[PDB]
């Protein structure tokens, strides 16, 4: 084929490889923030299930 194909394929490859490089750097920045701040969907660490708290009236009033 002509030079066009090799040229424009190389442009297509470079774009793919470039978009991937920025996503990989963006994931490290994201993972650094979720882990240190716990305000994101990741690195959520368990806290006791509140559904097993006994809400009934007790033998004593002060509860």
């Amino acid at each position: 084929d002509g030079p066009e194909k090799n040229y424009e394929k190389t442009l297509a490859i470079l774009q793919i490889e470039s978009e991937k490089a920025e996503l990989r750097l963006k994931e490290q920045e994201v993972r650094r923030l979720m882990r240190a701040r716990g305000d994101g969907p990741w690195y959520q660490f368990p806290t006791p299930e509140k559904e097993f708290i006994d809400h009934s009236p007790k033998a004593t009033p002060d509860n």
Binding site: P57, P61, D62, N63
Partner: protein, 57 residues
């Protein structure tokens, strides 16, 4: 950090029911069926409020 609020010793003065347990237990069944409404409101106050200072009336 706060100052616990306590009633003064004259807010806690009432006429006591100074009878022994057997006296209460002998009269316990009739008393439960006579002083019920008054009794049943204090317990409601106590479980609702969860505070002894809020039901001193």
């Amino acid at each position: 950090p706060g100052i616990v609020e306590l009633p003064t010793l004259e807010e806690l003065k009432v006429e006591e029911v100074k009878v022994s347990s057997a006296v209460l237990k002998a009269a316990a069944h009739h008393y439960g069926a006579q002083c019920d409404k008054t009794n049943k409101e204090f317990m409601l106050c106590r479980w609702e409020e969860k505070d002894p200072r809020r039901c001193l009336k």
